């Protein structure tokens, strides 16, 4: 589970999702994918209706925003998002 | 001086401890137009923040640029504290891909302070 203003390791997450079976892509489209652009990590949790875009300031999560897969554009902010092992 | 990405990452980080810097991709520089197309294209690439005439902006709801005014637009690729590496060398690679091979780092706290310009060549 992930919250706004929660500190954490960028590289720890990435190898973690790899092992959890998530795919690293250029552009997040469907379930079980993640993408990286600088400060940003796009993530589509398995089972979640809506994908999430996390803004990293250094090691802290500045914002968790929902985004639409087709436009690739940021919708409203959320305070937290969960994750399935 | 036309550095490697390793060399760029090294001039940043050679910077005063705990100073907050932003890494930027120059998109368009000092050019008249409304730039509705790049501003739209940047949003579609997935980026969120941009620096537009020296203001930081949400790319989901950009400011409207005057047709007949000179504008300059940069993406904010990354925001970091100066302690890593690794993660920065990526972030630079990414910035270098948004412009054609340039990158700019700027003090987040003091906008009148000098900026670092890197060029991948």
The domain of B52 spans 1-121
Residue of B nearest to A29 (CA): B46
Domains in chain B, number = 1
Longest Cα separation, chain B: 43
How deeply is A57 buried, as exposed, middle or buried, from its count of CB atoms within 10 A (0-12, 13-18, 19+)? Answer: middle
* Interchain contact, B46 vs A42, CB within 8 Å: yes
Nearest Cα of chain B lies from the Cα of A74 at a distance, in angstroms, of 6
CB-based contacts of B86: which residues, under 8 Å, 6+ apart? A11
Partners of residue A62 in chain B, C-beta under 8 Å = 79
Q: Rounded to whole angstroms, how far apart are CA atoms A15 and A20?
A: 9
- Extract the tokens encoding B86: 């690794």
Partners of residue B43 in chain A, C-beta under 8 Å = 71-73
Q: In b/e form, how buried is each residue of B33-42, taking b as 16+ CB within 10 angstroms? A: eebeeebeeb
Q: What resolution in Å is listed for this PDB structure?
A: 2.8
- Extract the tokens encoding B6: 């390793």
Element (H, E) at A81: strand A80-81
User: DSSP readout, A9-49?
Assistant: -HHHHHHHHHHTTPEE-SS--SSSEEEEETTEEEEE-TT-S
Partners of residue B40 in chain A, C-beta under 8 Å = none
Are B43 and A3 spatial neighbours (Cβ–Cβ below 8 Å)? no
Of A35, A58, A65, the CB nearest to B80: A58
CA atoms within 13 Å, Cβ hemisphere of B19: 15
CA atoms within 13 Å, Cβ hemisphere of A24: 10
CB-based contacts of A15: which residues, under 8 Å, 6+ apart? none
The CATH code of the domain that includes B109 is: 3.30.190.20
Domains and CATH numbers, chain A: 1-85 (3.30.2060.10)
Q: Rounded to whole angstroms, how far apart are CA atoms A28 and A32?
A: 9
Are B43 and A73 spatial neighbours (Cβ–Cβ below 8 Å)? yes
Partners of residue B47 in chain A, C-beta under 8 Å = 37, 40
- Which of A13, A38, A60, A63 best tests the B interface by mutation, with the highest count of B CBs <10 A? A38
Experimental technique, in short, is X-ray
Long-range contacts of B7-11 (CB under 8 A, 24+ apart): B8/B92, B8/B103, B8/B118, B8/B120, B9/B85, B9/B88, B9/B89, B9/B92, B11/B116, B11/B118
* Interchain contact, B87 vs A10, CB within 8 Å: yes
How many of the other CB atoms lie within 10 Å of CB of A15? 10
3-state class of A2 per DSSP? Answer: strand
Residue ranges of the alpha helices (H) in B46-106? 87-98
Q: Rounded to whole angstroms, how far apart are CA atoms B75 and B94?
A: 11
């Amino acid at each position: 589970v992930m919250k706004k203003g929660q500190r954490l390791s960028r590289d720890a997450l990435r190898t973690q999702l790899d092992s959890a079976g998530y795919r690293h892509v250029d552009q997040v489209m469907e379930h079980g994918e993640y993408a990286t652009r600088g400060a940003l990590l796009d993530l589509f949790p398995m089972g979640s209706e809506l994908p999430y875009r996390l803004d990293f300031f250094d090691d802290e999560i500045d914002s968790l925003r929902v985004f639409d897969v087709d436009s690739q554009r940021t919708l409203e902010e959320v305070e937290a998002i969960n994750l399935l092992p | 001086m036309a550095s490697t990405v390793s060399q760029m990452v090294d001039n940043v980080l050679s910077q005063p401890e705990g100073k907050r810097l932003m890494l930027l991709a120059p998109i368009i520089k000092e050019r008249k137009g409304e730039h509705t197309k790049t501003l739209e294209n940047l949003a579609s690439q997935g980026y969120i923040r941009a620096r537009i005439d020296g203001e930081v902006c949400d790319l989901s709801d950009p400011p409207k640029l005057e047709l007949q005014k000179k504008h300059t637009i940069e993406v904010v690729v990354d925001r970091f504290k100066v302690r890593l590496t690794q993660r920065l060398a990526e972030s630079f690679e990414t910035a270098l891909e948004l412009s054609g091979g340039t990158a700019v780092v700027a003090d987040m706290d003091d906008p009148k302070a000098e900026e670092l310009l890197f060029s991948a060549n």
